Design a protein around this ligand. Sequence first.
Ligand SMILES: CC(=O)[C@H]1CC[C@H]2[C@@H]3CC=C4C[C@@H](OS(=O)(=O)O)CC[C@]4(C)[C@H]3CC[C@]12C
Ligand SMILES: *[C@@H]1O[C@H](CO)[C@@H](O)[C@H](O)[C@H]1NC(C)=O
Ligand SMILES: *[C@@H]1O[C@H](CO)[C@@H](O)[C@H](O)[C@H]1NC(C)=O
Ligand SMILES: *[C@@H]1O[C@H](CO)[C@@H](O)[C@H](O)[C@H]1NC(C)=O
Ligand SMILES: CCCCCCCC
Ligand SMILES: CCCCCCCC
Ligand SMILES: CCCCCCCC
Ligand SMILES: CCCCCCCC
Ligand SMILES: CCCCCCCC
Ligand SMILES: CCCCCC
Ligand SMILES: CCCCCC
Ligand SMILES: CCCCCC
Ligand SMILES: CCCCCC
Ligand SMILES: [Cl-]
Lengths: 330, 330, 330, 330, 330
Amino acid sequence: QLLRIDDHDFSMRPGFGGPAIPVGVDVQVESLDSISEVDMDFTMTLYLRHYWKDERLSFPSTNNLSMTFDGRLVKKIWVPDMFFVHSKRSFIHDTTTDNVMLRVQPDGKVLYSLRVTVTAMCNMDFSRFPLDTQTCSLEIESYAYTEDDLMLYWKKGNDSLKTDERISLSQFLIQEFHTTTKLAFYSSTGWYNRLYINFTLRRHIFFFLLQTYFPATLMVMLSWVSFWIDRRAVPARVPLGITTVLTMSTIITGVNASMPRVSYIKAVDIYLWVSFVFVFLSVLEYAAVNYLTTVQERKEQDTHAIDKYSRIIFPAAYILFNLIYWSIFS
Amino acid sequence: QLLRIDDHDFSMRPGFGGPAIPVGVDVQVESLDSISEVDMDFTMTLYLRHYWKDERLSFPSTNNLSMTFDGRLVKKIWVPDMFFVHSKRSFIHDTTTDNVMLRVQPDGKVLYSLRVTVTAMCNMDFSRFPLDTQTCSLEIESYAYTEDDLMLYWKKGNDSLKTDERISLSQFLIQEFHTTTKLAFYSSTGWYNRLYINFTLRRHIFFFLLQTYFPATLMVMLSWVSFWIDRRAVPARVPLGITTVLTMSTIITGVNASMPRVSYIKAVDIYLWVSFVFVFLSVLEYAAVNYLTTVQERKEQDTHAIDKYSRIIFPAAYILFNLIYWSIFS
Amino acid sequence: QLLRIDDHDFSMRPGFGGPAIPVGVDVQVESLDSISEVDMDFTMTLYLRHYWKDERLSFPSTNNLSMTFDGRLVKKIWVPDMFFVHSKRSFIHDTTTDNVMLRVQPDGKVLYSLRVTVTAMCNMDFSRFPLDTQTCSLEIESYAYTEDDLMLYWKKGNDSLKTDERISLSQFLIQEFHTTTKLAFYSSTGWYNRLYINFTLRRHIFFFLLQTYFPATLMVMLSWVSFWIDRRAVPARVPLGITTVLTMSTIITGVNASMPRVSYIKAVDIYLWVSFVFVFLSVLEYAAVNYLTTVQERKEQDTHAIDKYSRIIFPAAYILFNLIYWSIFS
Amino acid sequence: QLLRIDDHDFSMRPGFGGPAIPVGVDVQVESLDSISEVDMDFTMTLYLRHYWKDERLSFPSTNNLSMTFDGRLVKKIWVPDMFFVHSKRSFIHDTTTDNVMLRVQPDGKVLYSLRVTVTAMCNMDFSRFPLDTQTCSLEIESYAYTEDDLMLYWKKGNDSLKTDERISLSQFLIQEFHTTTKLAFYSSTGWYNRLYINFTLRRHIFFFLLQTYFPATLMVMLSWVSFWIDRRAVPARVPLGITTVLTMSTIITGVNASMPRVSYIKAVDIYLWVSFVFVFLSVLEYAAVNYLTTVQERKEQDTHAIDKYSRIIFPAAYILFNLIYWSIFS
Amino acid sequence: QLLRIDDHDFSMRPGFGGPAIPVGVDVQVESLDSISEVDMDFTMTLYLRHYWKDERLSFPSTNNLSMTFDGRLVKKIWVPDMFFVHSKRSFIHDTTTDNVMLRVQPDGKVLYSLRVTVTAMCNMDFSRFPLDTQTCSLEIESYAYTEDDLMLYWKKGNDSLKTDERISLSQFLIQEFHTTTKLAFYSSTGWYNRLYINFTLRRHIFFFLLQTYFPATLMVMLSWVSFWIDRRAVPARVPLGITTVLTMSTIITGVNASMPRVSYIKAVDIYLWVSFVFVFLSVLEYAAVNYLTTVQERKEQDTHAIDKYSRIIFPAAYILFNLIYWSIFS
Ligand SMILES: CC(=O)[C@H]1CC[C@H]2[C@@H]3CC=C4C[C@@H](OS(=O)(=O)O)CC[C@]4(C)[C@H]3CC[C@]12C
Ligand SMILES: *[C@@H]1O[C@H](CO)[C@@H](O)[C@H](O)[C@H]1NC(C)=O
Ligand SMILES: *[C@@H]1O[C@H](CO)[C@@H](O)[C@H](O)[C@H]1NC(C)=O
Ligand SMILES: *[C@@H]1O[C@H](CO)[C@@H](O)[C@H](O)[C@H]1NC(C)=O
Ligand SMILES: CCCCCCCC
Ligand SMILES: CCCCCCCC
Ligand SMILES: CCCCCCCC
Ligand SMILES: CCCCCCCC
Ligand SMILES: CCCCCCCC
Ligand SMILES: CCCCCC
Ligand SMILES: CCCCCC
Ligand SMILES: CCCCCC
Ligand SMILES: CCCCCC
Ligand SMILES: [Cl-]
């Protein structure tokens, strides 16, 4: 055997009982699988690499070049114990074998690689849905060793994060990948060092626009045509308002069937509910004209001024509301 | 080797055949995942810590400080056998390795930590839905050892429970974390010690109000516009009541399609069913006016008093019902 | 080592080549998780205990008391091989370790406990849905040993079954737990012994009543008010019947969207389909009156008798049908 | 030990380097779990038994009777390598232990049994849905050994297949179980022998009839009453046709929301789409009558013959179509 | 033993520290399970074969023929480390044992076969849905060895890919299977060689046509009947347009409820929304006639020209739009 595995005890870290051992980390992101709003999490697949030195793995050679081993020797040597903080579930691919790589230099330098899929929690705010921007992060930390025994740092500073050119999402836009570092404290174990991977997401508005705002505006404009019909055609102006109310209710239910039950109001609800009031007030206007006409004719025993005023009042108010709404929320 | 593992038989607990061995427990809660009403359970992620002493793991040193081992030595020494009572499923995270920590002091004190995710049953009452308050608990107990062989207690009394600052739920509010203790009895094995973790949850009423109560009140008020329309316009009052009835039925079905099939009446059912009776009587009110008009005119061969009374009778009754309902349920 | 594990071959049952070995069984039911109607199964969590004697496990002592071992010694001694018949899936809980208990007396008596979750098939008949009663059972049997090698029996007869006081179902009522025994035969292996656990379930009628029967009766009564409207009000009697038909069809679809596709008619189907027929004939009655009026007026060139008869005939028939239905099905 | 495991190498089949070894198979079917139309597969649970002889397992005895071993000795002896062809997923039950049986006769005959659950693909044709008949099969084959090294055959000819008396499907009828044999060829490995298990399935027509054909016929008959109403009552004949069209569209959508997106037309689609044309022609027929009367009145300035003809034309054509459809598709 | 497994160290590849070792690959595709549009992936099952030579496995014989071993010897010898790039999940079937074949020639040639199921990501374009054509591929690569240690190539060039004749999809058509080769580069490990398996898919248009385009055309043609009715029949022309608008909105919602939320407009979206505009303009046409009639009579105090022109204008425009649409997309 080239390596003297049987001559050492690998249940203790290198430099046991002494100074800490530095460990480097490199990360390459392969793809983002899915994003969930009800559960508030996301999925990511990446390659994780570790760098450290162990003098117990030295072997004699002349070329001074890295040598690759099959990978089943990992269960016989010491290996770091990194884990993902605030994760829900994760696994390692094992087809057709474990996706593990192990390269050892003659002096004792070791390279270790893995391929994992991780689901992690991300807190999102929907106060501007569906015109919002979200920020998420992925955290890496050692589980058993504190900063007094294991120091964790990025191998090459910012240049330690690589991304695939095929990363794409059908619903979002991904930008601004960067890495940071911070310390963590646990009340009963000690201090630990954390690594972060940050990115930003932006939503696409075209689908939501064409699927929600256009039908609502169409129904609102359809509600207006009743003002141009003679009041003597009783079975001609009530069905318009009734069907517009029904369609607005159906649209509201369909839109609300998707997002989770938050405790605050979203941007889309403001537009939909105001448009419901405009349609609702249309029915009341006709009832007022009908009642006034009956009272006026009773005392005695053309177009009324109410319709002529409404034909100009309603569109101006709707346009002003739309301008304000699209100026506030951009 | 620093530890003499092979020199002892670890199939027996320390102090075998003698007095019980005290074991301490510490718990830190990381996050609350989800809550289900159809299945009546919840998911939690936490860190579990154990404290005990074993003289067979003593090693000589001078600094008198804890030493950390990799973690694969756990399956070669004795370890407690705690489990979660009334759980549906659970697992231990194993990425990139088993989330296990092991620190041993020179005298023989041992620290053992784990990271687990548990789903546990919680019995909930929906008599005041959606203005109810729910209380749940998580139970920890030893499986194989009775009170005469293993004594279980909290390490620091009330101060043994810590919570993360990011624990939150989009639909519930979390409060009042505390711990208790109690004994349990099994008819064929003996007495055991149990530990409890208690918390309280409160719902948010904004979404339910805006999504259910407002449309029902709007429909009820819409049904009142038929009283101010002349009775000679037959195709002007029946469709209003018809569409209000259809909308109320659709709303009731949509609300009831989510909650489980309980055997008692909830608070939301009272409001929806009573308002359904008000809309139903609107159609019957029109029938009485129409029938009496025909009878009077036939014997013979302005506004009727029935509508004049109804216009004041209905809103007062509805307001009184709303006041009583919101006084009972606050 | 207190036990001489290495001095024997544990690949053979105790008393190999001789008389059969008795085995006892104790069961305690913890909870019932869920019940599925489309899949026709149920889920149960329980504790399973075995009692047998093996002289190869005897050890010297003086107190004559049971001694508890950790549980990893099970994989080196002989253990029975019970399994659940007609089960779809099952597993053993493994948090934080395998839920296994092992106690050995000095003479050789052994106790073995497990915690398992089992999903088993149950045949259900929905001819009286939703006023039906269902009976299900759970079966236990030895897989490899026949009655000539292993005898299976209840440890204490009837008193071998215990239930928790927290067992409950939101939609059913649990009662009448009891145990039986029966022999089984396989055409190519021999005779085996079986154990049974029986229980009964009863539904709750409040939800189904309030969700299905009341709206149908309300719609049927709504269809009756058209008889009190003058036939000259053409847009007053057709929309009522049309909307009642649409509502009845929607209710039928909603009810059928849950139960599986059985080959027989259910009790709830009879009540709904009869109601739809009554509403269907109401529309035809209006056409009969209208057609006769045109024919009568043509020859020539008040309330019709048909309506007067129907106003009394229809409610009596509906009440008679309801009385007969509620007397037959209790 | 009774068996000399350590004295032989079990990495080679019996008769290695020589003639092939015969292996017999017996199968008992326990239950059929479910059938999927969108995924086109089914689930089955069965017992699989193997028969062969190995002289290395001979042990001395005088009674000449089969002896049963616990089952953990399987991983130390040679065992066949059968697998299910065209399967999607499968597993072996392991509660409370692996469902494995092993009986060895004194001369060397071996019996080996397993309990497995298999999901397999079946190609189905829906040209006659829902009056179709489906035929599926399950295939068993050796993976690594060719016909020159392992000969596979049924142990007892036709009598090698047994079925439980509790096998039933809520929607299908099961009949005609039988077994066949055939050879298979792979372009780069050689020839293999296959075993088949065949059965037949038939559907139940009651649910589909009651849920689809009855409402469609009711709507078609309802659309016919418009020919018996006076044409001067304009708000009396249009809602009937419009609501029948809406109901037919809803029924078609509900029926189509289940079956997968096939590339051809199904039998149920023929009946529903033809009835849609009959209702559609009713609206156009009404429009033609109204236009002709207006033209006739303008030139000048009782029931029209078109309705009188239609009252006889429509029912006869519908009855003829029903007779043809129910004769073609039985 | 025939093979000297224990006499060598199999943690190093053949020719360790020297030239690369060629490896051949053969693939036979069994079936394609499903295709997902929301997740944009596909599932495939196949047999994977490897060819290489190792002198350490030589054994003496005279027949010079391949010898088959059971399959558990794989975990004691060196074996390649292939994996699937851009995959989501995968597994190896293990019923009733691991589906592994191992044949070794006397000189040292080794054959290794596996049966796996893989899910891979495919980027799809829905610009021409549902008249589009999709191209997907599957990638194979080595994980730990670079091109300087392991050379990967197809065993027989193009003739290394075989397909089963039972491969079929209910919604797609499969054609054009071929293989390619390309190099890959990672910034921190080196160069690797990849293999590709390409195929093409085409959709079936009959279902989408019959289910979406026919109802829309029927509704559009139905909306045209309002032009042949006299304008004095006021309650005859509005409900037709209103109900057609409602049906069109329902159809649009049903179509859009399935496809993912893309940022571009699909081919089916163009056809449906243009049809909605035609029906929408019909209501405005009726309003224009009604208003102008009142104005003319007031000044004063037969068929309108607008309807006469529209009866010819609308069908011509619809036919022209259909011709252009079906010419653009073929
Ligand atoms: C005076 C009349 O005779 C007209 C005037 C307004 C009309 C209603 C307007 C909207 C709808 C909703 C629709 O729901 S649906 O989802 O099933 O399409 C069913 C039809 C219905 C109830 C109409 C029925 C006919 C009217 C009462
Ligand atoms: C918390 O623990 C302390 C000390 O054990 C006790 O005095 C106090 O009552 C406890 N509080 C609660 C709410 O149980
Ligand atoms: C059953 O098997 C027997 C003997 O192999 C054969 O004669 C008979 O035709 C078979 N029956 C069927 C239905 O295949
Ligand atoms: C198949 O392979 C041959 C030889 O390598 C090559 O000439 C041919 O172009 C290939 N065909 C395709 C479709 O790649
Ligand atoms: C940035 C796109 C805004 C689109 C607004 C559309 C308002 C009708
Ligand atoms: C529409 C009724 C509103 C009642 C608000 C009550 C807030 C507690
Ligand atoms: C709506 C009818 C209720 C009948 C209740 C009968 C209780 C046995
Ligand atoms: C709905 C018409 C059914 C006619 C009887 C069919 C019997 C196969
Ligand atoms: C009803 C429209 C049919 C169009 C057929 C087009 C076939 C390519
Ligand atoms: C809890 C009973 C409330 C009744 C309100 C009408
Ligand atoms: C037992 C027959 C029930 C039928 C009720 C109408
Ligand atoms: C199979 C086509 C039948 C058509 C009957 C009119
Ligand atoms: C891409 C534009 C298509 C227009 C069809 C009329
Ligand atoms: Cl009308």
